């Protein structure tokens, strides 16, 4: 119900100037899409063509969100988001519910449409400048700025909160046990009702929002119930070679970085010497004790592992092979909050980048549902490779932070 | 003339104030030669009169076109530009001819004195103040200021461009079928119309501009090929780059090298390899615009390289949106690869060479991948799509790499080409330990100080060895130890190291490196029949490892 209102002054963190990020080149297809979207958005007054005296820029592109014909524009406001004031509406007064991750079902509703009805502080607009590129650099390139709250920007949720609250208050009344959580442009609606009874309450909520100005897409479904964890495990054989024992005393020495409760002494013993790798070595020194006692230790949660909402979640991902991928989310090295294993699109499929991009989004959705905060990824890919293709498989309305690394024998320690 | 278009609001960087730079006295011939040029300007309304209340000044110069006795005014705006706000980008991207589609009708207009035709924001005009010295050294100098976009000022290009775009918009929307490309004031107007109706539309465009003060001088490209646009010769069925000539001088002046860099920046975009590192360095520090600067041995050698570059000609055909783009890549002389993009056989749209990565250790399949990626991004910029690839690698080779490699990697859809050399993996580390083959426990270490070290091993068969080495480091001695065992061993061997650093390199299956040491290891590995590399923690007292210590 916030339309011809007074804007909410917005400022950039101290000493920081607005963004100046390069527009990555796009394909003729995506450009034509961005063009019709922006000229429509321009007639509805949500954006405005700007001069060249505006020195700022944020990348833009388009995607086909979770399987539809329609192109959705997507601005990569990550840099702007970083230089924007931490919002002090601090709706943080709405802490992340711990039941959403416990529900039998959780639907995701795109409420972005909302934002485009609330005006943006006239002085902050110049920082929302983006550029639609031209094919072959034949023309200057269309430059716009937002005259309203932009989807993807850190302050749109903050500034619209109050209004969202006042729209959901009714529904939440007539529906006590439903859990509604919001992150950026999306509503996370969970429930313990039978599926059909769930998909029913949602379509209800849609219509409800629909009668209040918010327009959502037609009929994403999750089930946090079945999310499982991937425990560190060791091999089991009848014959053990020096090799097998080395690779075993090895992994185990690394795991001692997580659980001090690991001992390798009766195993560092067995390797006394200079034997051939193949020489089948005995099951000596009560090693069963190490293997057995240690085999157990991999069932106790680390000494002091708890979610500090004041730190950032980090996510490392390893390519395991065979369309299988393993990952760990943590805030402090070795104090993983979770360790899982995306392994979907398994069997018949050949495209690492596509797989790593779908994994990243899956790990991100889980991280939000669980802590209501996206993690910073450490992708096992080369910068150039990832930047050439990732946007061809993106489907989320958010983009997490990320950096590129080089994976060593750490994969072994996770298979 | 001077367009009746709206001026763009300008500002100096936050916290800064206008330039206040002192001007040095020039010769009587100039102090008049300038008064002469500035009067022709004061007339046409370009610059304008000022005196007292203007605390600013930008240094002025004067120089002659050696061939015709014509002095041109040159204002040194280096200071006003450090103090002027940033504007957004004038595309590091210049059109590529191969991106143009064939056009039945074509025209090439250019605006004469495009910059003076655009007005400068009123409230910024005073920061462009400059003064012509006095000859009699008596008159209180002649202070001037600009009313139009000045040549050399930071934002003239961006603002002119913005102004062209707006003045063209009404027409472009009025005649949607006629295509216009614009790089500054250069307009390539191509249509589908017949000579008769094309020339008509051209006339209303030449009039749409004059209406806004933008003049198309009678030197319109003839509506006759070859057309010269952006530095290319546009023939009806092909295009070529006018060869770029770089000046050969004995004495270089700040202004000269300043201009050399400009020309070369543009050029680096048509020819890759052009370097302006050792030249831009010469422009370091604020030195008078004429004060002669000596070229460092590096700069002198940089220019020589660039010159060698630009000798090669460049030509191609136009783009056909109906056909598919195809790009082929050949491996060539250790770390370079050439490639060509075409639609029809042997009728190349564009070609090139891609240079190796800055990496420390790599292999051919890697480089081939980095190569595919560059052509991909390049094609998207130029044509808006990806090209189908023809590659010198087999489905098996790659599927073997795509498998063993631990980093995510992919190559778009392609087709094999038998043209040698073929890219291949020169060796395969064994997955399982080798039964029967000798097992070397390898180790190395050096003194972080003296840089002296020892590399050696100890095998199961009781074999041992230890070599002393000077000026080395732990890491290197660890690779040295792996080398040893690889020398003093059979065609099949097992090696055990504690160094994760060394395991990591060999594990990536490098076929070439920067350090000879690794190259030796590489040639050694290739000659072996079976190799299995295993890792074990350091100082934990594991196998022979705890005893491979002879320090
Ligand atoms: N194609 C271009 N490449 C680089 N700079 C250009 C180009 N077109 C215009 N400019 C810049 O704009 C200034 C003003 O343009 P102006 O119309 O005076 O000259 P021009 O476009 O270079 O050609 P001409 O002198 O024939 O009119 C130039 O001196 C130059 O610095
Ligand atoms: Mn011109
Ligand atoms: Mn020009
Ligand atoms: Mn060592
Ligand atoms: Na043409």
Swiss-Prot record, chain A:
Effect of mutating residue 389 to L: Almost complete loss of RT p66/p51 heterodimerization. Complete loss of polymerase activity
Gene name per UniProt: gag-pol
Result, substituting residue 183 to A: Almost complete loss of polymerase activity
Binding site for Mg(2+) 1: 110, 185-186
Record motif Tryptophan repeat motif, residues: 386-402
Effect of residue 184 to V: 58% loss of polymerase activity. No loss of RNase H activity
Mutagenesis / variant outcome for changing residue 398 to L: No effect on RT p66/p51 heterodimerization
Name of this protein: p51 RT
Section covered of the full-length record: 600 to 1026 of 1447
UniProt effect for mutating residue 153 to F: 10% loss of DNA-directed DNA polymerase activity. 22% loss of RNA-directed DNA polymerase activity
